């Protein structure tokens, strides 16, 4: 449970994302891919990319970053009331793409990193705390369904 002041910081921060969704999207995935190359393996569409340069040039990659950040963006605006928006994602990532929870943690760290990088000194210590908390709630709720499903 984030406090109400906390959600407000989450959603204010995410305003910054929404002004350039595709740009943040791409950098998040890029940071994820170059930081944890095994994650590349989950994407047949992306397993071809070797170089950061290749990633940056890929318009598909930007597309997919937009998908991933709109989804998350939609979840966060539910302020924790995300059960329905969540079962789909959990059930598919666990038996289909077989995404370890670890990867959810990788992409969370990567959103944080991207935000500091795009917004140095506009991403305060409380906002950081709030965004981390939000990203933890989500992960923990996916983690619950994953246990249920035995992943």
With helix as H, strand as E and coil as C, how does 6-45 read? HHHHHHHHHHHHHCCHHHHHHHHHHHHHHHCHHHHHHCCC
Q: Flag whether 113 is marked binding.
A: no
Q: How was this structure determined?
A: X-ray
> Taking a C-beta distance cutoff of 8 angstroms, is the pair 135, 111 a contact?
yes
User: 116, 99, 90, 94: which is closest to 31 by C-alpha?
Assistant: 116
Q: Flag whether 116 is marked binding.
A: no
Residue 46 DSSP class: T
Rounded Cα distance between 97 and 91, Å, is: 10
| Residue 26, number of CB atoms within 10 A of its CB | 23
Deposited resolution, Å: 2.2
* Residue given tokens 């040039």 in the structure block: 57
> Taking a C-beta distance cutoff of 8 angstroms, is the pair 150, 144 a contact?
no
| CATH number of 1-151, picked from 1.20.950.20, 1.10.287.180, 3.40.640.10, 1.10.490.10 | 1.10.490.10
Rounded Cα distance between 14 and 21, Å, is: 10
């Amino acid at each position: 449970g984030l406090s109400d002041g906390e959600w407000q910081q989450v959603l204010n921060v995410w305003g910054k994302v929404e002004a350039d969704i595709a740009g943040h999207g791409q950098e998040v995935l890029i940071r994820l891919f170059t930081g944890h190359p095994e994650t590349l393996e989950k994407f047949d569409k992306f397993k071809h990319l070797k170089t950061e340069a290749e990633m940056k040039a890929s318009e598909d990659l930007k597309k997919h970053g937009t998908v991933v950040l709109t989804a998350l963006g939609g979840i966060l605006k539910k302020k924790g009331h995300h059960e329905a928006e969540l079962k789909p994602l959990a059930q598919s990532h666990a038996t289909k793409h077989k995404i370890p929870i670890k990867y959810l943690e990788f992409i969370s760290d990567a959103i944080i990193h991207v935000l500091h990088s795009k917004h140095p000194g506009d991403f305060g210590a409380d906002a950081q705390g709030a965004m981390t908390k939000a990203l933890e709630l989500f992960r923990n709720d996916i983690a619950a369904k994953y246990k249920e499903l035995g992943f």
